[PDB]
Amino acid sequence: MCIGVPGQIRTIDGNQAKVDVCGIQRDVDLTLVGSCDENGQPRVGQWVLVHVGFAMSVINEAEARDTLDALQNMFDVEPDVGALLYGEEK
């Protein structure tokens, strides 16, 4: 149900987008950031903090990567990371 993880805006459909949360795409509402950049460029390839099904903040690749490295640290230390990643518990 809940979510609070970085991902890449890997595809866009309208106000909704299909953010790859580093393993599978989730439908995410972009109202808080807009589906396009200020210059009208579609946000495809940009990164975003997904929280409760909304774009909490749009972020750069480096910010997402740093956040993911911190976030995974609690469980990447064990093979449980693989059981999660290749499982259906998410």
d(CA 22, CA 28): 14
For residues 12-26, one letter each, b for 16 or more C-beta atoms within 10 angstroms of the residue's C-beta and e for the rest, the string is beeeebbbebbeeeb
SS3 14: coil
Q: Give 22-75 as a DSSP string.
A: SSSEEEEE-TTT-SB-TTS-B-TT-EEEEETTEEEEEE-HHHHHHHHHHHHHHH
Give all domains of the chain, ordered by start, each with its CATH number: 1-59 (2.30.30.140), 60-90 (6.10.250.910)
Residues 6+ apart with CB under 8 A from 72: 81
Which residues partner with 41 through β-bridges? none
Residues 6+ apart with CB under 8 A from 45: 8, 9, 10
d(CA 46, CA 34): 12
Q: What is the sign of the dihedral through the CA atoms of 60, 1, 28 and 10?
A: positive
Q: Tell me how far CA of residue 73 lies from CA of 23, 57, 65, in angstroms.
A: 17, 22, 12
